[PDB]
């Protein structure tokens, strides 16, 4: 599970509201504290305001509707840190929410490249129509052309030992 938040904040010195600007940042994280942490990280690297001179005025959660659980196609732009350097790339996913899309990327890179979730950075999330799809993976499922049978058996009962003449699986 992963959530989406938008954080707002200003600069202060020995006195208040020293600049009339307000800064904003949308972030995918698990909770508000991990959200606030990211806001501090970006401010210090793109500007030079350290925490002691900042104040957060607001944090809000962003939520969709999707009462019917309709399935949508999304494209995601990302980078991650390896032992060598920083690696950029783009991949496409299907799901019922932007957060559902984002949790699947994080799982993928951990599986394929052996990276902990805190070393992955999301740059952009975009919802796409059928003509926009670039890579091969999801297109068959998007064009609604897939059926398959079950490969995994399923247990009939919670009992550990059963009679030879009973039905065992599904």
């Amino acid at each position: 599970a992963i959530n989406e938040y938008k954080v707002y904040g200003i600069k202060i010195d020995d006195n208040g509201v020293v600049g009339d600007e307000v800064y904003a940042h949308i972030v995918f994280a698990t909770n508000e504290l991990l959200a606030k942490s990211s806001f501090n990280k970006i401010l210090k690297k793109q500007k030079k305001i350290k925490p002691k001179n900042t104040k957060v005025i607001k944090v809000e959660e962003i939520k969709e509707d999707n009462k019917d659980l309709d399935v949508k196609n999304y494209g995601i732009d990302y980078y991650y840190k390896s032992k060598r350097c920083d690696h950029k790339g783009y991949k496409e996913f299907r799901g019922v929410s932007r957060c559902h899309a984002v949790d699947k990327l994080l799982c993928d890179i951990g599986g394929r490249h052996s990276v902990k979730r805190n070393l992955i950075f999301i740059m952009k999330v975009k919802e796409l129509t059928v003509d926009e799809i670039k890579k091969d993976k999801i297109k068959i499922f998007a064009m609604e052309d897939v059926e398959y049978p079950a490969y995994r058996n399923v247990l009939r009962s919670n009992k550990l030992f059963v009679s030879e003449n009973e039905k065992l699986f599904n």
């Binding site: 200003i10 202060i12 208040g16 800064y23 904003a24 940042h25 920083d86 999301i122």
Partner: peptide
């Protein structure tokens, strides 16, 4: 403690991980 503030809320600036840092 840090003081209280009243803010006008025009003039918003967005921040983003646009710099890819090759």
């Amino acid at each position: 403690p840090k003081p209280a503030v009243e803010m006008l809320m025009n003039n918003i600036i967005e921040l983003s991980y646009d710099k890819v840092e090759s």
